[PDB]
Amino acid sequence: AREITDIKQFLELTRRADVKTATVKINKKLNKAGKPFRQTKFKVRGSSSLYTLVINDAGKAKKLIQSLPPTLKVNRL
Amino acid sequence: AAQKSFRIKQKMAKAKKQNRPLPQWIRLRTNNTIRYNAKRRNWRRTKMNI
Amino acid sequence: AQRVTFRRRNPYNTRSNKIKVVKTPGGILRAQHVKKLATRPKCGDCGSALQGISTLRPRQYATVSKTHKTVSRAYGGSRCANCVKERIIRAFLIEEQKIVKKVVKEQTEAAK
Amino acid sequence: QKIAKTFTVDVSSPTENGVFDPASYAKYLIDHIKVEGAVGNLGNAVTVTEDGTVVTVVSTAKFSGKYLKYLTKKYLKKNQLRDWIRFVSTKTNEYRLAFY
RNA sequence: AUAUGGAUUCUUCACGGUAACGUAACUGAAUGUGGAGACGUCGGCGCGAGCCCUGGGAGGAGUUAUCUUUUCUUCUUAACAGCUUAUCACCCCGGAAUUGGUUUAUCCGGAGAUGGGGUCUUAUGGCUGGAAGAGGCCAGCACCUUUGCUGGCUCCGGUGCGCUUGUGACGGCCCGUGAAAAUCCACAGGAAGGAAUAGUUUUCAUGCCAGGUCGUACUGAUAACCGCAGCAGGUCUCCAAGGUGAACAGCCUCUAGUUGAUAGAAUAAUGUAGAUAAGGGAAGUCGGCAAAAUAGAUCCGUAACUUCGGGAUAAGGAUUGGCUCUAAGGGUCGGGUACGAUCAACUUAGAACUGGUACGGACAAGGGGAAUCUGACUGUCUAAUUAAAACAUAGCAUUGCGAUGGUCAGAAAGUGAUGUUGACGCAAU
RNA sequence: UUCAAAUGAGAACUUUGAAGACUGAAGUGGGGAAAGGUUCCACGUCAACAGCAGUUGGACGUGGGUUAGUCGAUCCUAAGA
Numbered sequence: 001a002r003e004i005t006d007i008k009q010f011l012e013l014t015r016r017a018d019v020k021t022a023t024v025k026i027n028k029k030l031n032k033a034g035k036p037f038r039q040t041k042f043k044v045r046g047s048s049s050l051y052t053l054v055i056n057d058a059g060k061a062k063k064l065i066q067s068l069p070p071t072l073k074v075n076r077l
Numbered sequence: 078a079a080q081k082s083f084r085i086k087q088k089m090a091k092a093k094k095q096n097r098p099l100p101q102w103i104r105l106r107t108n109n110t111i112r113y114n115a116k117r118r119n120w121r122r123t124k125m126n127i
Numbered sequence: 128a129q130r131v132t133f134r135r136r137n138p139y140n141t142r143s144n145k146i147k148v149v150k151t152p153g154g155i156l157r158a159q160h161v162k163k164l165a166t167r168p169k170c171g172d173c174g175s176a177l178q179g180i181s182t183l184r185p186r187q188y189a190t191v192s193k194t195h196k197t198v199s200r201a202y203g204g205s206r207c208a209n210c211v212k213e214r215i216i217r218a219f220l221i222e223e224q225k226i227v228k229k230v231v232k233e234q235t236e237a238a239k
Numbered sequence: 240q241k242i243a244k245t246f247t248v249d250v251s252s253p254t255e256n257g258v259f260d261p262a263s264y265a266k267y268l269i270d271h272i273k274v275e276g277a278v279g280n281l282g283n284a285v286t287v288t289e290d291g292t293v294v295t296v297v298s299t300a301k302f303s304g305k306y307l308k309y310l311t312k313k314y315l316k317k318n319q320l321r322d323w324i325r326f327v328s329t330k331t332n333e334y335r336l337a338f339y
Numbered sequence: 340a341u342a343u344g345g346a347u348u349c350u351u352c353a354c355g356g357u358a359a360c361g362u363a364a365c366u367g368a369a370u371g372u373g374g375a376g377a378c379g380u381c382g383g384c385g386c387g388a389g390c391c392c393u394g395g396g397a398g399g400a401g402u403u404a405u406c407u408u409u410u411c412u413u414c415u416u417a418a419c420a421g422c423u424u425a426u427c428a429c430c431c432c433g434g435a436a437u438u439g440g441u442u443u444a445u446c447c448g449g450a451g452a453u454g455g456g457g458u459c460u461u462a463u464g465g466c467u468g469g470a471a472g473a474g475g476c477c478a479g480c481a482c483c484u485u486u487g488c489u490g491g492c493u494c495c496g497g498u499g500c501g502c503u504u505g506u507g508a509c510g511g512c513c514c515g516u517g518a519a520a521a522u523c524c525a526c527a528g529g530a531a532g533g534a535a536u537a538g539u540u541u542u543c544a545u546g547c548c549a550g551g552u553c554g555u556a557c558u559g560a561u562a563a564c565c566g567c568a569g570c571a572g573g574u575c576u577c578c579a580a581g582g583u584g585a586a587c588a589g590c591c592u593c594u595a596g597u598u599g600a601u602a603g604a605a606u607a608a609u610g611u612a613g614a615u616a617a618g619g620g621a622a623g624u625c626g627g628c629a630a631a632a633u634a635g636a637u638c639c640g641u642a643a644c645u646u647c648g649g650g651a652u653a654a655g656g657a658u659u660g661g662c663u664c665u666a667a668g669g670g671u672c673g674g675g676u677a678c679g680a681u682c683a684a685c686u687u688a689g690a691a692c693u694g695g696u697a698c699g700g701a702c703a704a705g706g707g708g709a710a711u712c713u714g715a716c717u718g719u720c721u722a723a724u725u726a727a728a729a730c731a732u733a734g735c736a737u738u739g740c741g742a743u744g745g746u747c748a749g750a751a752a753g754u755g756a757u758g759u760u761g762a763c764g765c766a767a768u
Numbered sequence: 769u770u771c772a773a774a775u776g777a778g779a780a781c782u783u784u785g786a787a788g789a790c791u792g793a794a795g796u797g798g799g800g801a802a803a804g805g806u807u808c809c810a811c812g813u814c815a816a817c818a819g820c821a822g823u824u825g826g827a828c829g830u831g832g833g834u835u836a837g838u839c840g841a842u843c844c845u846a847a848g849a
């Protein structure tokens with residue numbers, strides 16, 4: 001039910017006690033007027049709401065995923 | 078109907094159970110005298126007044 | 128063409144049974160029932176909807192922070208500012224003229 | 240702001256069974272593609288050819304792939320070829336002519 | 340149930356804004372007060388939603404002797420959450436006659452207008468999260484099989500006295516002024532409690548546990564109910580597409596649903612229901628009973644009499660198809676402190692041409708007039724032989740009564756109606 | 769209303785296909801309230817019943833089916849009791 005943009009805040013969520021699972025979605029999407037680009041939504045299933053953080057920059061996306069806690073049960077796709 | 082009191086549903090239930098043919102094995106008992114179920118009821122031949 | 132049924136068992140058009148047509152992700156029309164609209168709280172003095180205050184149906188006011196139930200002047204959510212302007216002025220002026228009456232009628236008692 | 244558009248037709252499958260003539264076919268386009276309401280008007284505004292095994296329409300004017308399908312349906316209808324050949328989309332704007 | 344984070348505190352119980360008011364929070368007992376719950380009806384005007392119409396594009400389908408860049412169809416987005424969004428109202432600056440502002444509807448201003456700046460409610464809408472992973476539409480492989488598997492596309496717009504419903508700011512009406520309670524919040528109050536070596540705070544965020552009992556099928560009617568019955572009767576309600584047209588009419592159609600209702604052969608009399616008839620035209624008959632005639636719209640024309648409101652569609656007339664043109668009626672933009680440019684609407688009137696003089700072409704749709712009797716009117720009744728002149732009604736007039744009372748109830752009563760009443764009342768003619 | 773197939777001892781009447789029409793969204797459509805009470809659904813099936821028929825049925829036989837913290841009741845008050 002929540003969207004999130006502070007990439008710092010996000011991280012802190014995923015290390016909260018109640019957070020057992022997560023999921024990464026990937027969408028094809030097109031930019032501005034012309035070409036496409038790879039959108040990636042990071043979803044953290046909290047106890048009472050699903051936080052989802054969108055990273056348009058596919059770059060930011062990769063070296064985000066390797067930040068993800070080694071203990072979190074991530075759902076890929 | 079369509080939204081009943083439990084008392085009525087109960088009666089309703091009891092009256093479904095009673096709505097069966099005579100159990101044919103009774104016909105075989107010494108001195109048995111019941112031919113058929115003579116209190117059978119049908120929803121469109123006799124209303125049950127609740 | 129897509130028509131639509133009530134959702135609760137009550138088939139009549141009562142103030143508690145208003146409907147809204149809605150297009151679902153299935154690509155179809157579905158009714159939704161609709162709570163009666165909330166009305167704006169009113170000033171206790173003059174009677175207009177008092178501004179600054181949220182408007183919900185009554186029990187919904189207990190699921191809402193106290194800031195949604197006031198403005199920050201004396202008699203916040205209760206009376207409406209202009210009404211409190213009047214209240215202050217008159218209070219002052221009257222307490223003042225009390226002092227006037229006291230000393231005037233006091234002097235009566237000294238020359239009569 | 241003018242925009243050119245490309246439309247391919249993979250007429251191989253039924254061409255290779257003798258029953259299709261990419262020849263008079265792309266002529267049918269040439270002849271009946273209406274331009275601002277008329278035939279053979281596509282004056283350097285629509286070009287049409289046949290890479291041996293594939294027809295190609297290139298258009299600068301009012302032209303839709305729906306229209307293309309409507310034309311060659313009439314061709315296939317014209318030469319008794321319905322029952323036998325479908326106009327079909329594969330990828331968008333890239334169309335083929337299925338046999339069986 | 341409760342901890343963790345935040346907030347608050349050495350100026351203990353937050354700051355900011357001139358203000359309307361702002362916010363993630365920001366102690367608050369007795370008591371008192373205020374709000375919500377919570378309320379008629381109709382009219383037009385404004386906005387929403389869904390439906391309707393419709394352009395481009397991407398798909399599938401139909402027709403193709405001939406014609407049609409065609410006909411039909413898919414292109415969707417829930418509760419909930421973040422931000423944003425409003426007519427109204429309110430604030431600050433200001434000080435108004437040459438009075439201004441202003442609604443379709445004439446209301447507003449020295450008790451502060453017009454102007455400029457701001458505050459507010461969040462109906463409603465927009466963007467994002469929910470959410471494309473769903474659903475919708477296709478194509479390409481697979482095979483008795485569970486049944487898969489793999490790809491695509493699911494996009495961008497337009498229009499309005501439209502239709503239904505919603506809601507707003509207003510306006511009309513009343514000897515009619517159009518429920519209650521549970522429940523929720525707020526404010527006034529300040530009993531009290533509470534920090535610096537550390538306190539106060541769960542109306543701010545996040546976190547934990549739990550939510551019993553009964554109904555839930557189906558019918559809802561020319562067969563699931565009531566009429567002895569699978570009875571042409573009766574029985575409360577919501578949703579509601581396209582054309583014609585004023586229209587939720589009639590007539591035709593899409594979606595859905597039916598195609599139920601003994602059947603066959605014949606077509607005598609007499610029927611029942613539907614039509615027509617030369618010449619005459621109510622001569623029929625108690626009686627024009629039945630039937631026929633009339634009918635829409637536009638224009639023209641319209642008597643006696645009248646409570647001046649009517650009578651009135653009085654009466655009486657012309658006109659109306661198709662096709663092709665003409666003219667008038669609007670929106671939106673930039674113009675130093677006269678015009679230009681484009682997009683989108685069926686109304687109304689004029690003018691040609693045209694036909695076996697037809698044209699509200701089916702459907703739909705008033706006969707009119709002159710008098711007597713009678714009830715003023717609208718309204719009411721004898722379910723199942725009387726709808727009327729009968730009853731009612733407003734209007735008029737008479738009667739009783741100031742409560743220890745009038746009229747009426749009850750076997751009685753520390754009983755009851757009028758009475759939440761008081762003669763501009765209640766009761767009785 | 770019609771043709772044909774299928775099924776069945778048996779077909780004007782069942783099933784499926786085809787054609788012809790109808791209701792025409794003020795519905796013969798999609799749901800509900802009262803009332804019914806299992807009529808719903810499936811399999812079997814024709815003695816009676818459905819004022820011809822029957823292989824069909826709201827019939828007969830045997831079974832299956834109605835899941836809630838949020839939909840109602842339950843709470844509140846109304847005339848009144």
Ligand SMILES: [Mg+2]
């Ligand atoms: Mg009955």
Ligand SMILES: [Mg+2]
Binds near residue numbers: 133134135136
């Ligand atoms: Mg229901």
Ligand SMILES: [Mg+2]
Binds near residue numbers: 179
């Ligand atoms: Mg506030």
Ligand SMILES: [Mg+2]
Binds near residue numbers: 181
């Ligand atoms: Mg607020």
Ligand SMILES: [Mg+2]
Binds near residue numbers: 353354
């Ligand atoms: Mg603060």
Ligand SMILES: [Mg+2]
């Ligand atoms: Mg109160």
Ligand SMILES: [Mg+2]
């Ligand atoms: Mg009140």
Ligand SMILES: [Mg+2]
Binds near residue numbers: 378
């Ligand atoms: Mg009420």
Ligand SMILES: [Mg+2]
């Ligand atoms: Mg459509």
Ligand SMILES: [Mg+2]
Binds near residue numbers: 418
């Ligand atoms: Mg809701």
Ligand SMILES: [Mg+2]
């Ligand atoms: Mg302003």
Ligand SMILES: [Mg+2]
Binds near residue numbers: 431456457
């Ligand atoms: Mg300001």
Ligand SMILES: [Mg+2]
């Ligand atoms: Mg209505």
Ligand SMILES: [Mg+2]
Binds near residue numbers: 516
């Ligand atoms: Mg009023």
Ligand SMILES: [Mg+2]
Binds near residue numbers: 168196374524
């Ligand atoms: Mg309140």
Ligand SMILES: [Mg+2]
């Ligand atoms: Mg004390």
